[PDB]
Structure formats: structure tokens, C-alpha cells
Amino acid sequence: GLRAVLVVAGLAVLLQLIRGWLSSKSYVFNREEIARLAKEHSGLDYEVAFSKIIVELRKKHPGHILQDEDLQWVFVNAGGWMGSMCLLHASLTEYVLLFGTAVDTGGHSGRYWAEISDTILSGTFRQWKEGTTKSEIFYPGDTIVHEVGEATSVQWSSGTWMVEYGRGFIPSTLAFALADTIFSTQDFLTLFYTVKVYSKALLLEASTHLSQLG
Amino acid sequence: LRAVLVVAGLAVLLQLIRGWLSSKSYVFNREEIARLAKEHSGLDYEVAFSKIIVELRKKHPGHILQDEDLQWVFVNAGGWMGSMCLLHASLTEYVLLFGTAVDTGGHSGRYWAEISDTILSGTFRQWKEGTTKSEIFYPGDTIVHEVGEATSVQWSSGTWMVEYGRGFIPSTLAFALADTIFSTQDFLTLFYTVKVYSKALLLEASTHLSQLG
Amino acid sequence: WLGLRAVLVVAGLAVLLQLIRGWLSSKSYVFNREEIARLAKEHSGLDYEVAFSKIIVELRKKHPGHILQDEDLQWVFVNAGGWMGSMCLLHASLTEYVLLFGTAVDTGGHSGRYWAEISDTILSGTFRQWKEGTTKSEIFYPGDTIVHEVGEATSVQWSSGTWMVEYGRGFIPSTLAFALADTIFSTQDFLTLFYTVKVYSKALLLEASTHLSQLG
Numbered sequence A: 001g002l003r004a005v006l007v008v009a010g011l012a013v014l015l016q017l018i019r020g021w022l023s024s025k026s027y028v029f030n031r032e033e034i035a036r037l038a039k040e041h042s043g044l045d046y047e048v049a050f051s052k053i054i055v056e057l058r059k060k061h062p063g064h065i066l067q068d069e070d071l072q073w074v075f076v077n078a079g080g081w082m083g084s085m086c087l088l089h090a091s092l093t094e095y096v097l098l099f100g101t102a103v104d105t106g107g108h109s110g111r112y113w114a115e116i117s118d119t120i121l122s123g124t125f126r127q128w129k130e131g132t133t134k135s136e137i138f139y140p141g142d143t144i145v146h147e148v149g150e151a152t153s154v155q156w157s158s159g160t161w162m163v164e165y166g167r168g169f170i171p172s173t174l175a176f177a178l179a180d181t182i183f184s185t186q187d188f189l190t191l192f193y194t195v196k197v198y199s200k201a202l203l204l205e206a207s208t209h210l211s212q213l214g
Numbered sequence B: 001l002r003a004v005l006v007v008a009g010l011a012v013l014l015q016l017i018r019g020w021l022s023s024k025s026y027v028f029n030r031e032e033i034a035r036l037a038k039e040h041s042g043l044d045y046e047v048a049f050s051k052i053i054v055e056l057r058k059k060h061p062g063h064i065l066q067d068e069d070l071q072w073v074f075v076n077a078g079g080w081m082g083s084m085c086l087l088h089a090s091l092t093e094y095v096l097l098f099g100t101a102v103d104t105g106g107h108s109g110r111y112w113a114e115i116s117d118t119i120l121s122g123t124f125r126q127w128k129e130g131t132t133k134s135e136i137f138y139p140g141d142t143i144v145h146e147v148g149e150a151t152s153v154q155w156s157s158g159t160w161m162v163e164y165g166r167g168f169i170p171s172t173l174a175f176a177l178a179d180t181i182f183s184t185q186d187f188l189t190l191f192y193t194v195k196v197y198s199k200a201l202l203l204e205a206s207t208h209l210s211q212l213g
Numbered sequence C: 001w002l003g004l005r006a007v008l009v010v011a012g013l014a015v016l017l018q019l020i021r022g023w024l025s026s027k028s029y030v031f032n033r034e035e036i037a038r039l040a041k042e043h044s045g046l047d048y049e050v051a052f053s054k055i056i057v058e059l060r061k062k063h064p065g066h067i068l069q070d071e072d073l074q075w076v077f078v079n080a081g082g083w084m085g086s087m088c089l090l091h092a093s094l095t096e097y098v099l100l101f102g103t104a105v106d107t108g109g110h111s112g113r114y115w116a117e118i119s120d121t122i123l124s125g126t127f128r129q130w131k132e133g134t135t136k137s138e139i140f141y142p143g144d145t146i147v148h149e150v151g152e153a154t155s156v157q158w159s160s161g162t163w164m165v166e167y168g169r170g171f172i173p174s175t176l177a178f179a180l181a182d183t184i185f186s187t188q189d190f191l192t193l194f195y196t197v198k199v200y201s202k203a204l205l206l207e208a209s210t211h212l213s214q215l216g
């Protein structure tokens, strides 16, 4: 079977190409930067911290964060839980957003080709890692790392808000982000809002690349 | 120009339906159901259920199913799980008793209909779109899930309420069945839901025929 | 006559259902619900991990060759009916399965509706059951046993740290649709789907190899 071996080798070479590109790529942010910025302001009210974190992010990384007139809270229904996001930055390999919920929810965390860090500004974050029978609760200031290829169970109490950074192959999350919209909530207006904010963030990153070149 | 023509055609359809819903006669109204439920909100929710059903059959004869056509049917939707007892249902109205004996919550749905819920017992947490804070509602209060808006709903164990919906009722069907098709696989409950809805529609049609002749 | 074709389909499905029902009524089983319930309640006073170990030991002694070995035991996430838990499969055939189930988070949802009877004996935590057609639920504690009967559908809810021993008997294939739906249409965690298929393949092959060893 020459063609099946060619398919195996070709899919392997595509994976190898993306993996080597992700290892040798320059990034705008890093998980430690976002985590420390969020932990520094985790002692305030989460709204005050939201404002301060957005201001600091726009100061240190101009042209990589959406403006105030492009920021809106969009519901996120995924993995059986329901939260809300405010997207600040998004490329093909990075994204920064404000995430959280005003209700008690929980479910599957997803399993993607990306590493996702969450630093709690308020509330509680229960993580139940795969292969164990016990979970751990995290509090404001802490940082949870949803590692690459790993799947956990997440649970948040009412009023839990955090700053989120994802790095890796971001498209590998879209299916997880849309399943509950297609097969449960049927809230396609929220789907439109999500597509709109992510289109805006991608266009911002493209315009910044063009502005850097000229 | 073809796309503008498509937009205009759907707009003319929307205005025709919207003007029909605004100038249509209705059997109930959301304020009537809300006041009736709040009047009995101080008693036990089951006893209040009985009194509310009797009062509705008195004020609106021929528009409410009889006792042998009332049954509790599970409702799995938007990630939450409750139960309903349908009392009335047409193409533009429905009245039911809703609630849950477990702690659940999820997406409220987004339809072309206005849905009001008056709590008989328990707690009702509503989280409106675009905000970072939610609110808890108690027996006697009424939540209005307005047309086109989406919220997050959450109910504690033992939460029961009286619900009235007005608008384009078919626009909710998909939501009410999604979790049954793609999660629970409880097609017997799907049959129960289709059955109770068919009974309510047939009651409304036969009542219209009897009033006309 | 099209009515003849519809009656032929109905009658054929009826004879198939009767054939499976009669096979299930005259079949020999490895376990029974009372055995698993009493064994779990006997160790329900200990920590759930210690009870897990003791229950597995007793089960492997009383039914050798029908339970997977230690290197074939792994915790696999179970997303179904809107809830999320975890399983450790010990035994599984086409008509029986024994596993350890539970959750370390607060979850709940639809219990499912299959052609099988499923029993759960609580080792720790709380188990809230809401039966169909009623407006009240009941909470059950370690030592109690919940029976998810054939054809019934309930709402289940578990508090964080709730663990139990589960036995199912009936037509096990009738559960696959429920057991995988949330993975296909929500979590997209196909690696967990692979883990589930792997452990079930191991249990089925163990039962087949045990029958072959008994025959020769």
C-alpha cells in the first residue's frame, strides 16, 4: 500500500513542520507575563483589575490589543459549561482574553494542541486532572495551566473571573468552542458575536504586520 | 441588487408576522399569569399548582388540557434539566408549569418569543448578556426573557414556577429538543413532548371550530 | 399493499425483540446486583480508595478470569447526559459490566434510558435521584444502593468526591449512544473516546478468552 504510507508520511511531515515552526516562532506575549500582570492586580475588584490589566497590556504591547469600542462580553458555551469572554488579542498562535462566569458551572476543559493559562482575579477554580480521583481548588492569585494534549474537568463558582492566555495552534480549539452552540444552545447570534470579535482581532494583527513593514 | 431584494423580502415577511402578532387576540397575557402565580406563591408549590390549573380552566374554558392529559415531562435544553407540565399551547401562546428538583443551569435560549416566569418556590439566578453580575429571584418575582435576548439561567433543587410564552412558538422547538437529540438520547421523552404539544394544538383547533360552528 | 410492508417491519422487529428478551431471560450471568451491592456496602465504611482495592481483590478471587488485571485498569472520563464523571472498568460483556464510577466535581444531568438495569452502591459522597413524573428528589448516602431500572429515566446529581461501585445487566450495546454522545457533540475529546473503546475491547476479549479456556 504505497498510497497509505504516503498519507502517513505526509500527515507526519505536516505535523513536524507546524511543530518546528511553533518552537522557533516569536511571540507577542508569554504565559508568565500575563500571569504576573493578572496576579499583581488580583487583590482589587475584578472590574477595576480588568481596567488596569487592559491599560497595562495596551501600554506594553501597542497595536496588539483591541480598542474599547471593540471590546464586548460574549457568552461562551462549551464542554457543558457556560461562561463569558472579552477578547483582547488573537492570532493564529496566541490569544489573550478575560474569562469568567456569574453562575456556577463546570464541565470538560477540552483537549487541544495549545497551552492555556488562567490566573484568577476573583472566585474559585476547581480543576480535576485526568487519571486521578481527587481535585484541587484554586483561589485569586493562582495560575492553572491546561497543558498541551491534556484534558481536565473545570468548575467555577458564581463570580469567578480570570485572565487567560493561549499559545499553540489556536484553530485546534474552534470545534470545542462551537459544539455546544451547534448542538445545544442554538444561539447563533452569540456565534456571530464570537466570529465578529475574532475576525476583528485577526485583522488587527494583520494590520500591525503590514504597518511594521510599511 | 439580488441580495438587497432578499433582505427586503425577509423584511416584508418579518413585518407581516410582527404586525399580526401585535394586532392578534390572545387567550392569556403574561401579566395575568404572573399575578395568578404570585397570588398562590405563598403556599406549597404542588397545592398552588392545583389551584392555578383550576383557576385557568375557570377563566379560559376550552383552552387548557384536562387532568388526564397533564403529565410531567423532562426538559433537557441549553445544558440544564427540568420538567414541564403543559397546560396550553398554540402557534403564538403557551402556558406551562416548569421547574426542577435538582440543581441545574445553562443557556436560556434565544427565540422570537417573550417568555415570563413567576417563581412559586426556590431560587432563580439570571445572568444577562453583556454583564459580569447575575441576580437571584425569589417566590413572587417574575423574570421576563425578552425577545432576542439570551441569558444564563440557574435553578436550585425544588425550584418551581409558572411560565407563559407569547410570540412565534415554533421558534423554540429546536432549542427544546437539542439536548435530547445530541445528549440524552431519551427519545421516549421526545415522544412525550411531541404528544403533549399535539394534544394542546388539537384542543385549540377544536375550540376554535366549536366557537365558530 | 404498503400496509403489508409496514406490518412486516413491525412484526420482524417484534420477533427480534422477543428473541433478545428470551435470550436475556434464560442466560447465565457471572455477577448479580445483590452480590455487587452487598460487597460494596461491606466496604462502604472505609475510604473509597481502600474500598476500591478491597472490592477489586474480592471480585477477582470470587470470579477469576472475568476481571481485568492491574495493568489494564485506568481512570477514563465519562461525559454523558450533561454530567461529567470517571470510570474504571473491571468487567464488561454484551450482557454485563462492572466498573468503579464517581466524580471529583459537582455534576448532574440525565441518567439515560437503555435496555439494561444498572445498580450503584455508594462508597462516598451523595447521590441525588429525581425520578420521572415527580416533583421531589431524594439524597442517598454511603451504604445505600440506587437501582436504575430498565426503561426508566431519572435525573442524577452528585456532589464533589462521590464514588460508587456499578453493575449493569441487560443489553449493554443499548448504552453506547448515551455513553458517547457528549463526546461527539460537545467535548470533542476523541482520545477519551479511544480510551473507552480500548478498555471495553479489553474486557470483551477477556470474556472471550475465558470461555475459550473453559472449553479448551
Ligand SMILES: O=C(OCCN1CCOCC1)C1(c2ccccc2)CCCCC1
Binding pocket: A076, A078, A085, A099, A109, A110, A116, A118, A146, A154, A164, A166, A173, A174, A176, A177, A194
Ligand atoms: O473562551 C475560551 O476560553 C474558555 C476556557 N476556559 C475554560 C476552560 O479552562 C480554561 C478557560 C475558549 C475560546 C473562545 C473563543 C474562541 C476560541 C476559544 C478558549 C479555550 C477553551 C475553549 C473556549
Ligand SMILES: O=C(OCCN1CCOCC1)C1(c2ccccc2)CCCCC1
Binding pocket: B075, B077, B084, B094, B098, B107, B108, B109, B115, B117, B145, B153, B163, B165, B172, B173, B175, B176
Ligand atoms: O420548557 C420550556 O421552559 C423552559 C424555561 N426555562 C428555561 C428557559 O428559560 C426560561 C425558563 C421551554 C419550551 C419547551 C417546549 C416547547 C416550548 C418551549 C420554553 C422556553 C424556554 C426553554 C424551553
Ligand SMILES: O=C(OCCN1CCOCC1)C1(c2ccccc2)CCCCC1
Binding pocket: C078, C080, C087, C101, C111, C112, C118, C120, C148, C156, C166, C168, C175, C176, C178, C179, C196
Ligand atoms: O459510565 C457509565 O456508568 C456510570 C453510569 N452511572 C451514572 C448514571 O447513573 C447510573 C450510573 C456508563 C457507560 C460508560 C461507557 C460505556 C458504557 C456505559 C454506563 C451507563 C450509564 C452512564 C454511562
Ligand SMILES: CCCCCCCCO[C@@H]1O[C@H](CO)[C@@H](O)[C@H](O)[C@H]1O
Binding pocket: A102, A158, A159, B123, B124, B125, B133, B134, B135, B136, B154, B155, B156
Ligand atoms: C441559584 C442558586 C443560588 C445558590 C445560593 C446563592 C447565594 C448567593 O450567591 C451569590 O449570588 C449573587 C447573585 O448571582 C452572585 O453575584 C454572587 O457571586 C454569589 O456568591
